[PDB]
Design a protein around this ligand. Structure first.
Ligand SMILES: CCCN1C[C@@H](O)[C@H](O)[C@@H](C(=O)O)C1
Ligand SMILES: CCCN1C[C@@H](O)[C@H](O)[C@@H](C(=O)O)C1
Lengths: 571, 569
C-alpha cells in the first residue's frame, strides 16, 4: 500500500485532529460538480453529520434513495506546528468510492466503501491557516467492485441502486475522519505472530517504515511495565510467563515501535495487542491450543437514523448485549467494520471472523472484480491483522456452479490473503449444499432450513432435509470444523401465535431449537453464529418488512423472546 | 462568571482538542472514590462512550438505574506548543453535578447538569505529555438544585432517583468534551443586540476580555466580506442593506473580535450571528417588526441508547422532521440543550424558547433560588448571541403563590434581565387560577387528556373555553403561547371510534385544541407536547416513557404529524 493503515494516535511525534461534526454536503444528480469547481467549495450545501450514512436524515424519497455522485466539504485549521510533518487526511471509509480534494487540489481516489482512505496532503496543506477538504463520493453499484449490484436508470435519468445483497445501500462518510501529522520517517506497518512456549511466549514481528533508521521494539504489559525489548525491523520478543489473551478474558500488552537516529527517537507507534494463537486441528478450532466453540452472531453496522454511521454507543450497547447472551464471537457481515469494533473486541475478548465485502452477495468484468476483491482483501488484512480478536478471514461465497475459472479466481484471493497475513490465520467462506472447500481451513454454512426451505408447517421436513445435508457432509469426512454463520427467521417483535407461525416470536424460538438439535448431532460442528444480532435495514420490497427482521434483538437493541434461548444455551 | 461560556474555536490564538470517545468509567456505590485515590485513576473501570448518557448501555437494572457517585476518566496528549497558555477542560455539561480533577488535582466543581463546565488546568497541565482527567459525577436529585427530586434509599443502601419531573434521570457526560488553549489575554464574553433602521441595521455590542489591550470588532457577511468594523470593547457596527435573519430563512453574519497589541493580534474570536429583532407588541410577537405565530414543539434531548447524548445525526433528523411539519419553533424543554442545537437552529432559521431546568417540575428554598439564578445566568450568557433564541422560559407558577414565591421569581427575572444584553422576552408556565414579570404567558394544558379525556372530550373543550374566556376577560394584553398539549399515543394503536392512546384520538384531540386556540386573538403560538416519544421513569402511567410524541422515538411520524403539517403549511 502507498499509505499506512495504522490507526491514528497522538504523541510527541504524531498528531491528530478530528474532522467529525457537521460537514457541508450537496447532491450532484447532474454530475456537474467537477466542471463547476465544487472541489473549491460547494455552491449550495446543506449540513451533513459525519460520521453517518446520509440516507435516513431526509424526509423525501429521492434524497433517501439518492444514487450517484454527491459531495462533502469541511474546513479545518491546521496548527502551524504541523509544518514539516507528513500531513494526511484519514477517512475511516468513503462509501463507496470517492476522490479527495484538499485546498482545491486532487489528492487521491479510492474504491471500496468499508476500509480506510488515506490522502497525503503534505504538499498542499497550509499550516497555520484554515484548510479545506472536499470529497466527491459515488454510491453506485456495479459488477467490478464490492459489494456488487447494478444501477437502474429511471426514465427521467434518476438513478436507483439495485443491490445484489440484502442490506440497504447506505453511503457517505460513515466513519470518523481525521487530519493527522506524522514524522517524515514513520512506522508505516507492522505485523506480529505468536508462538506459545510453555509458560512463555514469542512475539515474532516485522516493521515497515518510510526510512532506513534503526527500529527498536518494546513490549509493555497491561500496567506499562517493560517485558521485552529488541532491535531491528524483524525480530522476536521473548515474553516470560506470558499472560495470554483468552476468549472473553482478554489481556492486552502494548507494543511500542520506535524509530531512532543518533540523536533520539524519530517516531513512536504504540498499539495494544494480545498474545494468542489460533489453529485448526482436525475438526477443532484451537485458541491457545484449546478447542473453542464459536457462539454469537453475524452483525451489521446498522442503527436507527445513523445508518452505518459509527458511534461508540452502538459498540457499547452491542457488546453488553453480546455478553448478556454469553456469546464469544461475531462475524463482520458483510464488510470490514469500523476499526473501533475490533479494538473493543480485543478488550472484551471477543473472537471476530473478519469479512471482505464479497461474501454477502447473492464479458471482461471478472478480472476487474478480482482486482477489487484482492485489493479489499489486502487492505482488510493489513488493517486488521494485529487485533488478537481477529481469528479468521471470511473471503468468498461459493458459486452454485464452480468453473475452473471461478476456482482460479478464488485461489488468487486466498493466495493474496495468505501473502498479506503474517499470521496465516484460518481462512474461510460460505459454502453451497452438499471444489473450493480445499481453499478453506474451516467451512462456513449459511442455512435456512425452516425459513426459506420447508418453513412453518413443513419444519419437520426442514429438519429432515437439514439432517440429510449434514449426513452428506458427515460422509464426506472432510475433517474440518463447520461453523454455521447464518440461520434465522424473520421475526416481528410482538407477533405472538400459538401454535407459532413464521414471523412470530415463538417460531423464532422453535426454529432455533430445531437448528440446535441438528448442530448438536454432528461432532464436526464447531460454531454457531446466528443471523442476525439485530434487525437491520434492507432495500424495500415485498419480502422485507422495514428491513430484515431476523434479528434476535430489535434494531434499537432490545431482545426478542429468542434472545433468551441463546443466552441459556450459550451459558 | 469566573470563566468563558464561548464555544471553542481553533485558530492561530486558540487551540482545541476533542476528548470525545471511549472513556474509563466506574460506579461508586459506596462513595469511596475520593477516599481511595480515584482522582488519580479508576481502579477497575469499564469503557463508557462520551458523549452519552450511561444508563441504556447496560443490561442490568442496577446499572441502568444507578443513582449516586460515579466516575469518568480519560487520558490525552497535550501538544507541547500549548505551554504557558490558558488551558481549560471544557465539558458541554456534567450531569448533574461533579468535580473535575486533572493530573490528580482538584480543579473545579459545578452543580447543574445542562450547561458547560469550565475547568482551568493552566497550572496543572503537562504540555508535551500525557495528561489525565478524572471526573467525579453525581446524579442524585434534591430540592436545592434543578431539576428537583428526591433520592430514595432501598434497605439495601442502593439509591434510586425519584424525579419530580416527567423525564428519565439520564446522566453522565452527555455532551462533547474538549481541552482547549487560550491566549493569556483573551475574549471572555461578548454580547450583541440589534436595531433595524429602514434597509440598514445596527449591531450594538459589548466585549469582555481578560486584559486591557485594545479591541477591534469586525462583521463579515455570509461570504466573509467585511461589512463593518469598529474599535472598542463597546460599540456599534453599522450594516448597510442588512440581510436580516428571518424565520425559516436564516442569514448569518460572522462577528470577529480581535484583541490587538501594537501591530499584532493577541486573540481572535469568531462566531456566526443573525441580525434580527424580537419584540412583543400587545398580544403579538414580532420578528423583525412582523408578527410571527409560533408553530412547533417541546422537544427533549432523547434518543434510543444514547439517552441525552449529543449527536449531530439526531439534530439533522429532528430538523428535517421539524421542517417537514412546517414548524418554526421549539422550546428546549426542560433544560438548556447542547449548544449545537442552537447553532443549527441559527442556520435553519428556527425560533427557540430557551428553558432553564426549573420549568419542568410537577430552608432549602434559598439554596434552590441560588441554583435557579446560577442556571439562568449560565444559560443566558451561553445562549444570548444565537439569533434563534427569542425567549427565555424561566419558571413554573406555583399553585398557591406566596409573597415569598413572588420575591423568589422576582430575583430570577432580575438575574435574567441583568444577563440578557438583548432583554428579549421572558416567560414561564401559568396556572389555572406573576404576569408583570413575564413578557408573554405560556400555558401547558391537557383538556382532553388529563382532564375530561375520551368520552368527555366535549366537556374538556367547554372547560378549556371557560378558562380561555377567563383569560380573555382579564384583558392582560399579552401574547399567549401554548407550550404543551398532547395525548399519549401508541404507534399502531388504531380504534374506530377513537380511544385515548390511539392514533385517531391524538388527531381528534389536536383538532379540538386548534378549534379552541383559534377562538382567541391573543393566542400567538402553539408548541405541541412532544416532538417525539421520550424516556421517563417507569411507572403505571408510562408505557416505555412518554408517548405524547407526534413522532416515535426513532423519529417517524404518527398519524397526527400530518395534522400539524397541514395546519402549519
Ligand atoms: C445463503 C443466505 C445468504 N444470507 C445473506 C444475508 O446477507 C441475508 O440477510 C440473509 C437473509 O436473511 O436472507 C441470507
Ligand atoms: C405543566 C407541565 C406539565 N407537563 C410537563 C411535561 O414534562 C410532561 O411530560 C407533561 C406530561 O406529558 O404529563 C406534563
Amino acid at each position: 500500500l502507498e499509505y499506512s493503515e495504522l490507526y491514528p494516535i497522538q504523541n510527541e511525534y504524531r498528531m491528530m485532529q478530528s474532522l467529525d461534526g457537521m460537514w457541508k454536503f450537496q447532491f450532484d444528480p447532474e454530475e456537474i460538480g467537477k466542471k463547476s469547481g465544487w472541489e473549491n467549495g460547494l455552491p449550495a450545501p446543506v449540513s451533513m453529520p459525519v460520521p453517518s450514512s446520509f440516507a435516513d436524515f431526509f424526509t423525501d424519497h429521492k434524497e433517501r434513495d439518492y444514487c450517484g455522485d454527491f459531495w462533502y466539504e469541511t474546513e479545518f485549521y491546521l496548527p502551524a506546528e504541523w509544518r514539516n510533518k507528513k500531513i494526511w487526511l484519514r477517512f475511516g471509509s468513503i462509501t463507496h468510492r470517492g476522490t479527495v480534494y484538499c485546498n482545491g487540489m486532487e489528492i487521491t481516489s479510492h474504491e471500496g466503501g468499508f476500509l480506510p482512505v488515506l490522502a497525503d496532503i503534505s504538499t498542499v496543506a497550509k499550516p497555520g491557516q484554515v484548510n479545506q477538504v472536499v470529497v466527491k463520493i459515488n454510491n453506485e453499484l456495479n459488477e467490478t467492485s464490492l459489494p456488487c449490484g447494478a444501477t437502474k436508470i429511471l426514465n427521467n435519468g434518476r438513478k436507483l441502486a439495485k443491490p445484489y445483497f440484502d442490506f440497504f445501500n447506505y453511503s457517505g462518510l460513515q466513519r470518523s475522519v481525521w487530519v493527522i501529522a506524522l514524522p517524515e520517517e514513520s512506522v508505516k506497518d507492522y505485523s506480529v505472530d505468536y508462538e506459545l512456549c510453555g509458560t512463555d511466549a514469542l512475539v515474532k514481528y516485522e516493521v515497515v517504515t518510510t526510512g532506513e533508521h534503526p527500529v527498536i521494539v518494546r513490549l509493555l504489559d497491561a500496567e506499562g511495565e517493560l517485558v521485552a525489548e529488541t532491535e531491528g525491523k524483524e525480530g522476536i520478543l521473548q515474553v516470560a510467563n506470558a499472560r495470554l489473551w483468552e476468549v472473553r478474558n482478554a489481556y492486552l500488552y502494548q507494543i511500542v515501535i520506535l524509530i531512532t537516529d543518533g540523536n533520539g527517537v524519530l517516531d513512536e507507534y504504540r498499539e495494544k495487542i494480545g498474545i494468542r494463537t489460533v489453529r485448526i486441528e482436525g475438526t477443532k478450532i484451537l485458541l491457545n491450543d484449546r478447542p473453542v466453540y464459536l457462539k454469537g452472531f453475524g452483525k451489521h453496522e446498522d442503527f436507527p437514523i445513523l445508518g452505518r454511521g459509527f458511534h461508540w454507543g452502538i459498540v457499547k450497547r452491542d457488546f453488553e448485549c453480546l455478553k448478556w447472551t454469553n456469546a464469544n464471537c461475531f462475524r463482520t457481515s458483510h464488510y470490514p467494520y469500523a476499526e473501533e469494533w475490533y479494538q473493543f473486541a480485543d478488550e472484551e475478548g471477543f473472537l471476530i471472523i473478519d469479512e471482505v465485502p464479497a461474501v454477502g452477495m447473492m464479458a471482461l468484468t471478472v478480472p476487474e472484480l478480482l482486482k477489487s476483491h484482492i485489493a479489499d482483501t489486502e487492505e482488510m488484512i493489513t488493517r486488521d491483522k494485529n487485533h488478537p480478536s481477529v481469528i479468521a478471514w471470511s473471503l468468498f461465497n461459493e458459486p452454485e456452479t464452480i468453473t475452473d475459472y471461478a476456482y482460479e479466481y478464488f485461489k488468487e484471493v486466498f493466495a493474496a490473503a495468505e501473502t498479506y497475513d503474517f499470521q496465516s490465520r484460518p481462512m474461510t467462506g460460505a459454502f453451497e449444499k452438499n471444489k473450493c472447500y480445499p481453499l478453506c481451513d474451516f467451512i462456513c454454512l449459511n442455512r435456512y432450513y425452516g425459513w426459506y426451505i420447508s418453513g412453518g408447517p413443513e419444519i419437520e421436513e426442514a429438519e429432515e432435509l437439514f439432517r440429510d445435508e449434514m449426513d452428506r457432509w458427515k460422509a464426506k469426512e472432510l475433517n474440518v470444523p463447520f461453523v454455521f454463520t447464518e440461520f434465522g427467521t424473520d421475526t416481528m417483535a410482538g407477533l405472538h401465535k400459538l401454535p407459532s407461525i413464521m414471523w412470530s416470536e415463538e417460531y423464532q424460538k422453535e426454529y432455533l431449537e430445531m437448528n440446535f438439535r441438528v448442530f448438536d448431532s454432528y461432532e464436526f460442528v464447531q460454531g454457531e453464529l446466528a443471523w442476525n444480532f439485530a434487525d437491520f435495514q434492507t432495500t424495500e420490497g415485498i419480502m422485507r418488512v422495514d428491513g430484515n427482521h431476523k434479528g434476535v434483538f430489535t434494531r434499537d437493541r432490545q431482545p426478542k423472546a429468542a434472545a433468551v434461548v441463546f443466552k441459556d444455551r450459550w451459558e
